[PDB]
Amino acid sequence: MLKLIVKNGYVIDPSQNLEGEFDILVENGKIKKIDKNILVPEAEIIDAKGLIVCPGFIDIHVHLRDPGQTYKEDIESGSRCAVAGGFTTIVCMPNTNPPIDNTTVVNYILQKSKSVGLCRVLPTGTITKGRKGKEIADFYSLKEAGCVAFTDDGSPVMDSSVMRKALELASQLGVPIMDACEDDKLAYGVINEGEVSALLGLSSRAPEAEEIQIARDGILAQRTGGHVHIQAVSTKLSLEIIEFFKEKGVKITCEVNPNHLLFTEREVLNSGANARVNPPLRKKEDRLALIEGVKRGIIDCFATDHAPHQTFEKELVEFAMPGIIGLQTALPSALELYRKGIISLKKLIEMFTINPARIIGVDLGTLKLGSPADITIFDPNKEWILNEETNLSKSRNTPLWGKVLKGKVIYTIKDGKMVYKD
Amino acid sequence: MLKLIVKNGYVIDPSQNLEGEFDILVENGKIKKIDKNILVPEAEIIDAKGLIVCPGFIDIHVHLRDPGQTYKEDIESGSRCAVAGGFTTIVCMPNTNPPIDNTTVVNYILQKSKSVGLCRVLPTGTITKGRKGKEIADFYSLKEAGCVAFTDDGSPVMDSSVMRKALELASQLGVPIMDACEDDKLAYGVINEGEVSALLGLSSRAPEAEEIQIARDGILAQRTGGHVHIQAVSTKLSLEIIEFFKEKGVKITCEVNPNHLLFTEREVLNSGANARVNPPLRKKEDRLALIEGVKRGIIDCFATDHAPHQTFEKELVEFAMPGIIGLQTALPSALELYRKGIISLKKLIEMFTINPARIIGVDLGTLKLGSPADITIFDPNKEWILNEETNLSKSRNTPLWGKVLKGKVIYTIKDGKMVYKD
Amino acid sequence: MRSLISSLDLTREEVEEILKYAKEFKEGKEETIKASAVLFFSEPSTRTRLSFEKAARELGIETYLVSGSESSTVKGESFFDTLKTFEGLGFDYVVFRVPFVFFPYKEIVKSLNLRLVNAGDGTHQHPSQGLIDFFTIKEHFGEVKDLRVLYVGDIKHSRVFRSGAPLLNMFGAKIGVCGPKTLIPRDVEVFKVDVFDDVDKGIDWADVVIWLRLQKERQKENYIPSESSYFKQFGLTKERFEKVKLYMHPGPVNRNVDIDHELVYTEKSLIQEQVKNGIPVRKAIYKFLWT
Amino acid sequence: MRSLISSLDLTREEVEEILKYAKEFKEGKEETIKASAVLFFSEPSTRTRLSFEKAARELGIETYLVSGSESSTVKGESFFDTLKTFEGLGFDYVVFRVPFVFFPYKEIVKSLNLRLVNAGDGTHQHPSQGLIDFFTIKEHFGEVKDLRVLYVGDIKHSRVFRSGAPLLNMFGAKIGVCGPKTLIPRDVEVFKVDVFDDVDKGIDWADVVIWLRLQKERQKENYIPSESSYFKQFGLTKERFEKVKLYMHPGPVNRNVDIDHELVYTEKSLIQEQVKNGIPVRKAIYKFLWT
Ligand SMILES: O=C(O)C[C@H](NC(=O)CP(=O)(O)O)C(=O)O
Ligand SMILES: O=C(O)C[C@H](NC(=O)CP(=O)(O)O)C(=O)O
Ligand SMILES: O=C1C[C@@H](C(=O)O)NC(=O)N1
Ligand SMILES: O=C1C[C@@H](C(=O)O)NC(=O)N1
Ligand SMILES: [Ba+2]
Ligand SMILES: [Ba+2]
Ligand SMILES: [Ba+2]
Ligand SMILES: [Zn+2]
Ligand SMILES: [Zn+2]
């Protein structure tokens, strides 16, 4: 590995308004040149003919379950999922055990991720000590150790001064707060407060629980000057509120879990506990609004909230752990919107690359000369099935289990090294 | 590094009853041959002429303060101290913050120690969760992650069933308990209960606090079949009790902090808080008994209890953190006994090499063919001063600060690689 | 060899069949089923458990009673493992009442060689009560088609509502609900229901009103400021008695909360009739499930 | 007219007799015993109580159920006085489960005109379970002689181990134990047992492994640092499933503590078979004690 060439693919680099049939030369893990028919003496070649070539995808919302819940997933299994899904960078959430609220846990993750060596794993810290919601965590030490953001995911912050103080201390450090928006007085049940909760009598989680905290966060972001990133947006009103603050110049970004683009609460009737997730799958009108928010640029990126749980944690809905895996299914799920002509291919790539890069302030999601050779190569049309043959997660918890997907990664490249191939 | 030769030194390998002027050939980090005038094509050479060549020293009692107290010392600074003192292997204590009572902390230490790359750092786990003394820690997960022993150092275990259960579960796993013996009802003051406490009115720690727990541990070891290792023995009665259990075939080992060989409670009057240590420096009769226990083979090894604290933690004795650094001073301190003809050079080396190796069940402390090339090379007669010029610890807390020492490491070799030289 | 977990699983034909047996049993039909049933109750019950028990015994079914907090549930035996235990012990029927929602249930039902009968699962289903309520309404009026049936009270927590409403709907009845707005599901119209803010309008509209008990033991917060105020706002008071046409209550009644102390057993009350219909409907269910 | 309090009181011949009846009952033999039995349970039970109950009823024995905390035990009636009360009430059998060790028992048994059947006394005996476990092992292998039977887990607190091991030994089986060293009795070799520190060696050695539940409700202190660590160290994990030959568990199973969630009902599991053998063995016991 001095020299690599990605030949004959259809390159798309939205960060540079760059697209067409170009080759890419990689030198020492870095992007060296992008040009028609490049040829160099003694080069590694991967042939991308008929395929899409773009920056490595970045997922800013992943649960690696490591430390403490490694029977669900661990840094290795999650990293394999990531790269098999086209991700060269993932941000891991801090609801591990022990939680990421000290530099020992950060370092453990960084070192283990280096040993695994497939994608870049960027840790976040908790907003509060122990994620108990009471006292701000040591942002200064956690950022210095490598945390890129603070969240209490998957717990909301209930005290408004705690959230304000988080935003103040984080912005002072130049990093965002990622907020898990669900007021715990209005969201302590198991599924959406809609038709399915009404029909079955399952306890519910009110859409206002999410909306009220998003509105709170926009106001706090506005008044503190901090940047708040809203995780897994799930309702129409939510998007309206976000846009209202974006219109004012507030540093508020957001993401959508592709599952919320594909499924409604009705999925609880078809997939049972594999449709239990926080925030819940909500109504048709919400699903369609989300797609509209993707189209209109209100939703800044796709992020999986890859949240693996074992099958015995996905039995009776009432007792089931919330969450859906998604790293391996993000791309075909997104490509569904491309196929319906809702978004362009460039737009889909933006949402996986440069947009998430800008949210967390990393110079990635790009094929700019001199930048790391993180490259994803994919077939928008290749069909496959997520099943035992194909699943890289330790867990299986997704309503897309066993269903036909269209769109698939052929190559994932990280610092000029092929870390995944079909 | 394919090939290294240690030439012309006086080799001593007590594990093999091997001594004389021999050369050592090292191949791929391992001991290949030991013979008169070895010569090989394109070899690295270090000349050990006039020097003592023996297995790398192993210190089974070191505080690295990492995580959580890294202003005192950290894995890097402690490892430099270790190797500068002749140690290629150290066992770190679990009273870090967070304490070593889960696999995340173990892994952090293992990975950080690998990155530092100077000596082998072997973690221990706590006996109890949080070291709070109430519930046994997860020995099974901690051993599997790499812990070699369990201790609540520097806290005693006060409940006898807790200690019994520790011994049972540890022996089931084939690992020892290292016990910090000081009954907290009889040892809650700051210095020995002797002349100095009486004279000054400083709160004291009764020798019986240590003796009662050692006696308890011997009985528990006897009845459980577990192996208990008594840390930092400090009184005559203590040694009598240990010998009484050794005589019966009980798996009980012990160590002595070289400071207890050199200093008595009177040192509190000369060095103030740099003589504050648990167990305390006690009386002349105890000091002499310790030396006698070294001579008679009752004390199985030297171990520093290297316990760094900053200068502001070493001011008024009453408020001072207990502990003395010792990794860099262990060898000249031990050599004092050699110079007085109390122990042979072979015996001194045994106490630093094969004896500590056998206590923790590692195949080290040897120059056996095929074993790791951990080698220490030293001048028993070389004078130096521990001061700012020479100290590798972040801390300075030892009554030997600024005093002339005789005996000094010239080379430390770890897996065939020179990691330290004078 | 099947199970009855939810009203939502019954076709029109199945309901006609069950209710035909129930009518036959009510009119004194004898029948023998050589089976055993274990009644597994981890919530309180008087009438449901006793009517399932007495129904079984009058059919010749041997009955065995297990209350949850005396069972090996206390040692950590899961619901599934308990049922599987019942299967190893040779039970034909398991009549169960549990404090959680048994959903999803289809795969578990399918995997068991047992006839499972849901006697109440949390806030979810109580199908035999829905059948009893439908039968009771039908016995009174002749048919339920186009009848206006008002449920009053804690809809949100009511497995009685969730079992009765779909059956009534399926046969063309019109359902209304009235209660504290905090206890009406936002999407209650998934049951094709009209919502009355005001119980007096509901009572004028209704051909029959089913009062429901406040499910206090199921409520995760306080939903109403007080029981006596609830009674004034929603209860069958003496003043409302003049206007009410007919009424029901699955039981037990909380006097002076749901229904005035003097109004439990009047000529307008079918409450005792629901009790009396318990055994014949529950016999019909054992029979309906006997293959 | 006798009692069965402890496995230690059964001769070889008595065990052959009981198990012969059990096999006969398993193969469908009918028999009538005109007696009454009171089942007196002051600890939880599902299968033991229900199998003793159903066994009795299928033999024509009238069964009566008394749970301790509903009985006059709460008014201070001693165990002896309760049994003497049962005697005055004309019971033939008393099947009892109690939270203390019933020792010594011989003089009390001798003084009562009753057939006492120990369904579990604290950490002491559970003879019918030992008989069921022996019978289950024997039905599988043909004989138990020289078989290697490993018990895993909380030996110290196990009346199942104490009832099963002596019976197996008596017929030439070899017993092994493996569990947290804190839960293995120091003189466990009073049962002529080998001790395995390591469950993987035990599993390779064993022809059959009986997982035992942690007796948390009996443990007077904490003996293990955690349930998930216990599962990794001692439990039937998926990895161990490849190597395990055959296994048992008297019940109830704690999933992902004793046995992996997916491994309770496999082709290598006799767990359900133990349940199914409950009634025939317990019938055999009533019969064996009928004079
Ligand atoms: O309890 C209620 O309010 C209605 C209903 N009641 C009954 O079934 C009567 P019981 O609890 O006496 O069997 C129930 O849901 O359990
Ligand atoms: O409870 C156990 O772990 C084993 C054994 N279990 C049983 O007898 C089954 P049950 O408690 O359901 O009757 C017992 O000792 O009671
Ligand atoms: O907020 C959250 C957290 C997550 C998890 O399992 O970590 N799963 C979810 O469904 N929502
Ligand atoms: O027991 C102990 C622990 C130690 C420390 O500082 O860790 N220092 C001591 O002097 N004694
Ligand atoms: Ba049907
Ligand atoms: Ba006998
Ligand atoms: Ba009771
Ligand atoms: Zn998340
Ligand atoms: Zn120490």
Residue numbers in the entry:
A (entry chain A), B (entry chain A): 1 to 422
C (entry chain B), D (entry chain B): 1 to 291
Quote the authors verbatim:
Dihydroorotase (DHO) catalyzes the reversible interconversion of carbamoyl aspartate and dihydroorotate, the third step in de novo pyrimidine biosynthesis. Aquifex aeolicus DHO, is a dodecamer comprised of six DHO and six aspartate transcarbamoylase (ATC) subunits. The isolated DHO monomer, which lacks catalytic activity, has an intact α-site and conserved β-site ligands, but the geometry of the second metal binding site is completely disrupted. However, the putative β-site is restored when the complex with ATC is formed and DHO activity is regained.
The most convincing evidence demonstrating that a second zinc ion is not required for catalysis was the replacement of two β-site first shell ligands, His180 and His232, with alanine, which eliminated the β-site but had no significant effect on the steady state kinetic parameters. The double mutant was crystallized under similar conditions as the wild type enzyme except that citrate, which binds weakly to the DHO and ATC active sites, was omitted. Both the DHO substrate, dihydroorotate, and the ATC bisubstrate analogue, PALA, were included in the “cryo” solution in an attempt to increase the order and thus the X-ray diffraction of the crystals. The asymmetric unit in space group H23 includes one DHO subunit with one zinc atom and dihydroorotate in its active site, one ATC subunit with PALA in its active site, three barium atoms bound to the ATC subunit, and twelve ethylene glycol molecules (PDB ID: edo). In this structure, the biological unit in the crystal is the same as the native structure, a tightly bound dodecamer with 23 symmetry formed by six asymmetric units. The crystal structure of the double mutant showed strong anomalous difference density for zinc at the alpha site (above 17 sigma) and none at the beta site at the 3σ contour level. The crystal structure of the active double mutant showed a zinc atom in the α-site and a water molecule Jβ (HOH2080/A) near the β-site - thus eliminating the unlikely possibility that the one zinc atom was randomly distributed between the two sites. A second notable observation is the retention of a water molecule, HOH2080/A (Jβ:) in the approximate location of the Znβ site in the structure of the mutant DHO despite the elimination of His180 and His232 that hydrogen bonds to the equivalent Jβ water molecule, HOH577, in the native protein complex (3d6nA.pdb). Although the mutant A. aeolicus DHO has alanine replacing the two histidines and dihydroorotate replacing citrate, it is still very similar to the native structure as evidenced by a rmsd value of 0.29 Å for the 422 Cα atoms. The mutant DHO-ATC structure is the first with the bisubstrate analog, N-phosphoacetyl L-aspartate (PALA) bound to the active site of the A. aeolicus ATC subunit.
